[PDB]
């Protein structure tokens, strides 16, 4: 139990939060970048109809999977904003 | 499609080859049409001061003169003389041209919208009588024109008749951005819905 406990932020971390400036930065960065992953994915999927997956990935830059990369970037900010609202509203309603 | 034309035709002025293409005075007249119709105050303005070619040629035929006159009045905010020029363009620019005679009526329609837009931008309110005197048209004359544009909803203002004021409730805030976005997002849903359904079944 001693080992596990490394926080005084066990009950002081869900109502505790970072300013909304920083949440505006995450929202702005996240939306802006996903355009760029989306423009590579558009060049990419002009193909996906030739011979051999492995070739397409080299030549028209299927590497790292841009399809996978956009899903990851969307999933991370999507889950984060539900938390950001979820904590926001929780404070307004319980505290006053 | 005058948006595509507008970007192609500015280039035409700077450098011109004459083989199998209509006379160069005609090419200036086509450029000014597309610029006024497509672009708004700022872009339009900068474009006809940073085109030496138009300015060195001045007027040289009636069609060119009527188009150029319209231009100056529009960004310079003179509405007295805006209106004679409207009538003049109709007669000497659209009807003679092969490619704009189809658009004769489309042209006058859209141009009254733009002029009004820039005016509405600069004012919170106007009085109908003040707005009429600006044009050089009587009081009753104005009410008709505003009322063909307003239910279509690309003028985005309303008219208190009893107060005689014209109010402008066109958003440019966050509310405006909201209107744009949500309409496009319904369109994404709809596109996915149908193409979705078709692939699941097959």
């Amino acid at each position: 139990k001693m080992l596990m406990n490394l926080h005084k932020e066990q009950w002081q971390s869900g109502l505790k939060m970072y300013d909304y400036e920083e949440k505006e930065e995450s929202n702005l960065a996240a939306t802006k970048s996903m355009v760029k992953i989306a423009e590579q994915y558009s060049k990419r999927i002009e193909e996906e109809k030739e011979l051999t997956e492995e070739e397409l990935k080299t030549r028209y830059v299927g590497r790292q999977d841009p399809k996978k990369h956009l899903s990851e970037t969307a999933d991370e900010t999507l889950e984060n904003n539900i938390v950001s609202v979820l904590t926001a509203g929780v404070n307004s309603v319980a505290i006053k | 499609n005058f948006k595509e034309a507008a970007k192609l035709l500015v280039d035409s002025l700077a450098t011109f080859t004459s083989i199998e293409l209509t006379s160069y005075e005609s090419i200036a007249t086509y450029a000014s049409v597309t610029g006024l119709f497509t672009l708004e105050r700022t872009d339009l303005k900068s474009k006809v001061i940073d085109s030496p070619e138009l300015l060195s040629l001045i007027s040289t035929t009636a069609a060119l003169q009527s188009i150029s006159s319209l231009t100056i009045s529009l960004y310079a905010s003179d509405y007295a003389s805006y209106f004679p020029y409207l009538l003049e363009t109709y007669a000497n620019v659209l009807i003679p041209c092969k490619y704009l005679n189809r658009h004769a009526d489309f042209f006058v329609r859209e141009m009254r919208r733009k002029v009004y837009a820039q005016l509405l931008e600069s004012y919170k309110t106007l009085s109908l009588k003040s707005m009429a005197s600006a044009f050089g048209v009587s009081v009753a004359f104005l009410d008709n024109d505003l009322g063909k544009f307003i239910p279509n909803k690309q003028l985005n203002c309303v008219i208190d008749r009893v107060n005689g004021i014209v109010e402008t409730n066109r958003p440019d805030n966050k509310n405006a951005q909201y209107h744009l976005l949500v309409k496009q997002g319904d369109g994404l849903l709809t596109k996915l819905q149908k193409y979705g359904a078709a692939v699941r079944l097959t």
Partner: protein, 217 residues
């Protein structure tokens, strides 16, 4: 060569480079034998004097002019014009300006340069004047503005329309009572706006995914 080179840079909106070419142009006419070259020399002196007004240095207009040899050799109604408008710009009076141009019209008529830069100077003196007046206001009556600025009622209204179109102080002009509301609030949410390009790209991509699905059909 010198005269034109001066006049060319005045239109390009740098008056530092303009002024130096006119300094040398004055000397050529002056020291050449007069016989008609004296009439042209007068014109260059005025062109020296116009430049330092645009550069926003109105004591130095005053410095070139002296009763030692500058007025004495070349004396015109335009030499009297030059310093009256230079005092108008200093005062920041639009009244003093129009008074000068009525009685010194013939300088504007005989020299194009002088006419040109008296329009540009007028409007920017105007623009800057107005901004200061309406700065600690919102719902300022145009009647009140018009006193302090010295122009007519009508003139204030006409000038504001163009400026709101520049967006150079924003605001909206209400003729239902005669106020000018001066809104200086931030425009456009950056975050919402970049969401339009992201949807934009998703709306394009789905037509392309549907090109894949032609394979299944």
């Amino acid at each position: 060569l010198d005269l034109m080179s001066g006049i060319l840079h005045c239109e390009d909106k740098d008056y530092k480079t303009a002024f130096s070419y006119f300094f040398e142009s004055f000397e050529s006419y002056h020291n050449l034998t007069t016989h008609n070259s004296y009439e042209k020399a007068c014109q260059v002196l005025k062109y020296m004097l116009l430049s330092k007004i645009m550069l926003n240095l109105i004591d130095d207009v005053k410095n070139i002019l002296n009763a030692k040899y500058t007025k004495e050799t070349y004396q015109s109604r335009g030499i009297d014009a030059m310093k009256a408008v230079a005092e108008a710009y200093n005062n920041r009076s639009l009244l003093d300006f129009n008074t000068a141009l009525k009685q010194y019209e013939k300088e504007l008529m005989g020299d194009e340069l002088t006419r040109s830069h008296f329009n540009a100077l007028y409007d920017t003196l105007l623009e800057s004047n107005l901004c200061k007046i309406i700065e600690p206001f919102e719902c300022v009556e145009i009647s009140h503005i018009s006193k302090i600025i010295g122009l007519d009622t009508q003139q204030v209204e006409g000038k504001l329309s163009q400026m709101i179109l520049d967006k150079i102080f924003y605001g909206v002009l209400d003729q239902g009572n005669g106020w000018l509301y001066v809104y200086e609030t931030p425009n456009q949410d950056a975050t919402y706006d970049s969401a339009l390009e992201l949807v934009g790209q998703l709306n394009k991509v789905v037509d392309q995914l549907f090109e894949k699905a032609s394979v299944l059909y």
